[PDB]
Ligand binder design. Structure first.
Ligand SMILES: NC1=N/C(=C2/CCNC(=O)c3[nH]ccc32)C(=O)N1
Ligand SMILES: O=S([O-])[O-]
Length: 257
C-alpha cells in the first residue's frame, strides 16, 4: 500500500517490511497515525541526512491520518539482539560496532543534529552487519548558522541518559549523545546495563563514581575498553571526553581478532 505490499511487522509507531510487487525491492515503512509535530520534525530531520551509518530516508506519503516514511531496510535487525544477556558479545564485534556508531554520531553532530536517544534498540544492522543509527523521532537541531543552542527538554531513556540531563536546567547536546554511546559500549561488553539511572538516588551509580570496578558490570570488561569507559562515563559533562579524543583512545585503535 500503495505500490508496495506490507509483508511483516518489523518493530511496533509500527515499522512494516514493504516488498515492491513488481521489482521485489524491500524497504522498511514506518506508520504513524497522527490522530493516535514530532512526526513533522522527524521527516524534516530525515531529509537532511545522508551517511552510510544512518538509516537512509527514501521519502514519505501522507495518505489521510497515516504518515508512511520509507526507510532503508536493515535485515540484520537490532544491535539489541546481538547482545547476549550477562555476556555481551566478542570484543572485536563490539569494537567495530562502536567505530561505526561513532562515525554516525560524528556525522550527526557535524550537521548540528543530536539524536537524544541512542540505545541498542535504535541501532540497526544491515545485510553485511553494518550499524545504522535509526529513529529521528526525538532528534533536534542543536547548532544552527554555527551558533550552538543548549537543550532544556528532558528526553531519551533513563538507563542511557547522562546525569546532567536529570540535574541541569540547560545542558550541551553533544556530551549527552557521548554518554549514551558509553552505556551502549558497556551493554555490548558486559551484556547488562550498569544502573537504572545516573542519579544520587541510585546505588550502582554511586558505586561507579566511587570506582568500585570489582563490581559486576565492570569486572567483566577488561582493562583497555574499561579505561575508555572511565573517560566517557564522567559525571561532569565538561570534563567528559569528546569524540576527537575517543578516536585517539588506545582500545579504540587496538587491532582486534
Ligand atoms: N527505532 C526505529 N526502527 C526503525 C526501523 C526503520 C528502518 N529499517 C528497518 O529495517 C527497521 N527494522 C526495525 C525497525 C526499523 C525506525 O525507523 N525507527
Ligand atoms: O569513575 S569516573 O570518574 O570515571
Amino acid at each position: 500500500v500503495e505500490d508496495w505490499d506490507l509483508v511483516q511487522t518489523l518493530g511496533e509507531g509500527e515499522v512494516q517490511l514493504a516488498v515492491n510487487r513488481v521489482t521485489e525491492e524491500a524497504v522498511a515503512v514506518k506508520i504513524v497515525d497522527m490522530k493516535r509535530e514530532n512526526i513533522k520534525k522527524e521527516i524534516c530531520i530525515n531529509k537532511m541526512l545522508n551517511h552510510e551509518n544512518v538509516v537512509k530516508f527514501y521519502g514519505h506519503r501522507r495518505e489521510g491520518n497515516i504518515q508512511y516514511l520509507f526507510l532503508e531496510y536493515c535485515s540484520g535487525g537490532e544491535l539489541f539482539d546481538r547482545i547476549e544477556p550477562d555476556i555481551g558479545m566478542p570484543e572485536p564485534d563490539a569494537q567495530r560496532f562502536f567505530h561505526q556508531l561513532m562515525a554516525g554520531v560524528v556525522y550527526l553532530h557535524g550537521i548540528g543534529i543530536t539524536h537524544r536517544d541512542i540505545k541498542p534498540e535504535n541501532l540497526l544492522l544491515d545485510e553485511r552487519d553494518n550499524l545504522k543509527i535509526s529513529d529521528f523521532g526525538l532528534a533536534t537541531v542543536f547548532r544552527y548558522n554555527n551558533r550552538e543552542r543548549l537543550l532544556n527538554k528532558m528526553c531519551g531513556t533513563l538507563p542511557y541518559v547522562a546525569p546532567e540531563l536529570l540535574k541541569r536546567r540547560e545542558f550541551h547536546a553533544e556530551p549527552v549523545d557521548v554518554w549514551s554511546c558509553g552505556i551502549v559500549l558497556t551493554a555490548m561488553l558486559a551484556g547488562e546495563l550498569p544502573w537504572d539511572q545516573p542519579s544520587d538516588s541510585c546505588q550502582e551509580y554511586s558505586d561507579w563514581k566511587e570506582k568500585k570496578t570489582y563490581l559486576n558490570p565492570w569486572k567483566k570488561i577488561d582493562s583497555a575498553p574499561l579505561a575508555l569507559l572511565h573517560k566517557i562515563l564522567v559525571e561532569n559533562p565538561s570534563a567528559r571526553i569528546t569524540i576527537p579524543d575517543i578516536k585517539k583512545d588506545r582500545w579504540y585503535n587496538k587491532p582486534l581478532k
